[PDB]
Amino acid sequence: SKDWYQHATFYQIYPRSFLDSNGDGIGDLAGITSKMKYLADIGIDATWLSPPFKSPLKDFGYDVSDFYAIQPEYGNLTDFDKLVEESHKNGIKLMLDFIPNHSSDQHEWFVKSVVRDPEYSDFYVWRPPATGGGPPNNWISVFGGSAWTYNQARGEYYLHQFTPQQPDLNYRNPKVLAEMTKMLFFWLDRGVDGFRLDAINHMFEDEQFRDEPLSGWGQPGEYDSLDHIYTKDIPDVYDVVYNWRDQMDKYSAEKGRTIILMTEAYSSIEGTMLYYESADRKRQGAHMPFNFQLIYDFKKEQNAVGLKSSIDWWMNNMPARHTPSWVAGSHDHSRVASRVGLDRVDQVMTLLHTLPGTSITYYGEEVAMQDFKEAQQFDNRDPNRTPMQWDSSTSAGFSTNTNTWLRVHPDYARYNVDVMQKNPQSTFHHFQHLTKLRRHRTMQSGEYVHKTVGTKVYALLRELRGEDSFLTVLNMAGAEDTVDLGDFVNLPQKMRVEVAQPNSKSKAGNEVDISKLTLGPYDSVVLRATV
Amino acid sequence: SKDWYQHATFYQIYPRSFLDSNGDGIGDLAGITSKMKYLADIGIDATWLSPPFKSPLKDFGYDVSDFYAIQPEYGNLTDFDKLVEESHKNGIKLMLDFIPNHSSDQHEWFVKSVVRDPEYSDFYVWRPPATGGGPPNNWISVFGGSAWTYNQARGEYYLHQFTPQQPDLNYRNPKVLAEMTKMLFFWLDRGVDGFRLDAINHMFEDEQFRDEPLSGWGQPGEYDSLDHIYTKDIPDVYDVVYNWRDQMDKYSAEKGRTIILMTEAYSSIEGTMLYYESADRKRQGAHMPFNFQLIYDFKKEQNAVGLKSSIDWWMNNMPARHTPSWVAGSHDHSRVASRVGLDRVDQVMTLLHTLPGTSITYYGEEVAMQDFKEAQQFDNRDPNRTPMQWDSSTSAGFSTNTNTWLRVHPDYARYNVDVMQKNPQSTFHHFQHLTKLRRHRTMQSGEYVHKTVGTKVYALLRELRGEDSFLTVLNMAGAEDTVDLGDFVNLPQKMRVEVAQPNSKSKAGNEVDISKLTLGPYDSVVLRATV
């Protein structure tokens, strides 16, 4: 289990929306705990837990009022401990979201910093008004408007790259780094198996607090109107990540399990790849920087050329001897079924789970959940955070309460675990076929050879000496075609259909002739051969 | 062999510059005939002969005044026959440049068409001046200025997409298509093995002769200032090429040798690929459209990401089950050594000859010839067309005459066949190593798997079940590095150095550990793994 992260099958749980175990309409930790067997049953061996920490919920958990406490409606620390134990019982690693860049403005540290408590005054970024009034500089929040908010009591502005309710922590202050590092080991000491480092490339800012220059586009006041050279990718962040990785490896050696780090950065491809490893290859950082290529580029009118080149954009730019990861949805993104269509969730899965490396599934993708736009109450991302759909009972089995924290999608009686489990030809069964296939050594450890077959068909061969070979084929067009896969020189003419998607011109267990493989609209198949 | 074109080792001969056999300073056909053994000796099995037809030389052979006759200084039709016979005796196919779009304005047809001879009047494109005067429409020659030239005798303009000395032939006239097809078979009957179709996508123009729209770039009067929707890629050409291919396939069956077509089009990638095959796969055209990717993109500051994505741009966009071809220079392009540097000619060769399919070598690449800019007398392409460099004698052995049609590059005593053959560490010996390696079944027929190894190293695996595997590795940086090739899952840790370029950190015949392969600046090696 030292190499578990190199071919993990990840599932992102959003704790407010997974399962409510006490009828208040809000998911909770005991609810998750009761479903860790379900996750293992569908082939998951690792979870990404979105932040369950105490939070005023201005950014639903990503604005943390206490980094050591559980949000009360989700449970307490003993509930968290029971979830860690039940995850490990079911063979599932638990990766906790870690929010380094900012705290809630209701955090004790910030309340005390506002009133100039000497213990915490410098925990945040405070600057006087500019000469002649106004913010200290022109920096703009990720969400628009000034990155600075005035506090009348202090007579100063504090920095927030995100909302004003998310004051940035001051990592130029070594006590800030030391405290957040200590908090990391607190959660490790409860059995956690790794961390996702949220918004990591927002950590440091220019020490001279200089104005950023204009981008050359966008209206004044818009985030995109400035070139963010003083507020993103400030390179001191890399040494912090590399140092944390070195502390995780040492902890891993002492405790006998492999602790991993993933980073979330929206950055240049070069700035992203430096989180894996320094340019000179002397330092290691994140095991797996988040890779959003499939969210960006698996689009409704993509062809196989664009799909392949999107995949190669990650792979070509990676450092050698590291692990790629792949993800199609998250708590920050519109659901796959709404983004690309119900008739395309199945081929997205087929691709997701057969690409080399680690696949990441957002809760509800396995029953083809859709955005419920009309449910939005608090946030533009509400539609992709509606309650998990478990059965056809009240509130889709998410809660006994008919009023849930966000409304359940109205079609839940057709798109839920119970109904789909009864249908051998459902997306749910397709998901399970694929995660079961991921256990095959060729999928875990084999080479990958991918090609187009004409510009509309994508094909991905996985091969490992001494093992059967597997060929994923996707039809990126909405019309039937019959194609010749003969450019894969080393495959036999006859192959077996290991997997065929719910609506497919193939059927699992049949043989096909790969010189004349018929693919239905948006088809996906995984073919098998003994070489 | 019916699939010779699928892994041909091509060599482009420029007849004026290859070998002068009679002391007038001009290359001739007898000179070429006497070097076909040299070509077979260095692993060439196919030649592209630049046009030797009668020509006033305003575009040095590409302005043809008699498509059935040889330019007198090059010899006559019996010399041509002797070259064909000696080519075949050495196992070399001869592909003849075919010039369909236009003739010289000294061709008898155009002379007669000017005076409105009814036999030839409609062989060219004649239109009255626009109402109020001026050319029929706004079309602009490829070489700048109007695509129309007035003739007072006719009181009309004739069309030339190239120089005014290259009037466009009128393929809307079936007699023109019949006559040019007749001429193809004339050369086929003399034993030629194929044709390169010059400037093929300029063949047809808008039948309404409508003005072309602006592109949005460039100054008025420049070629790049119009969107060439009426003068380039008019799709009627595809049917002409598909019909020619069908006629070549029939001729191939009757005569018992495989005739190929290659097409030269500067086009969109989509317009280029339609020369292979119709969109619906019902029609075949060129066996190999020219692929200039390596000329465009193997550049002084390229890295492995850019190099791989350039190769993938061709491969991704190809139709399935067709042959790729690769070329690094030509009679229209600055020579590799001047383009990228003398210290990079060797790694260009290594890549060129190990990519799947057919490689094309420009005469003189094998002795690292350089542009002689100061030799320019007639044409911007003169510097890359200087005489072939055979030995250290007068005029590099190209001629007994010190006055050659273009001056010989002044460094010829160091960069010539004779000197380099005596030096087993030379670019010439490296060339022969690679063309000998090309005859291995794995290179002719094996799969290809290519990757970056970090952003500066490109690696290309050729593998074929039951045969040894070969791994090409190129350092795109000008500094030494030691890299780990372990991402190629199925390769052994120990491999043999099959080829090492002249200045390399590896030596042929040594064993390397591919977890730590040291590469010198701009290195290139081919490693072998036994079965």
Ligand SMILES: [Ca+2]
């Ligand atoms: Ca910050």
Ligand SMILES: [Ca+2]
């Ligand atoms: Ca034309």
Ligand SMILES: [Mg+2]
């Ligand atoms: Mg795994």
Ligand SMILES: [Mg+2]
């Ligand atoms: Mg060959």
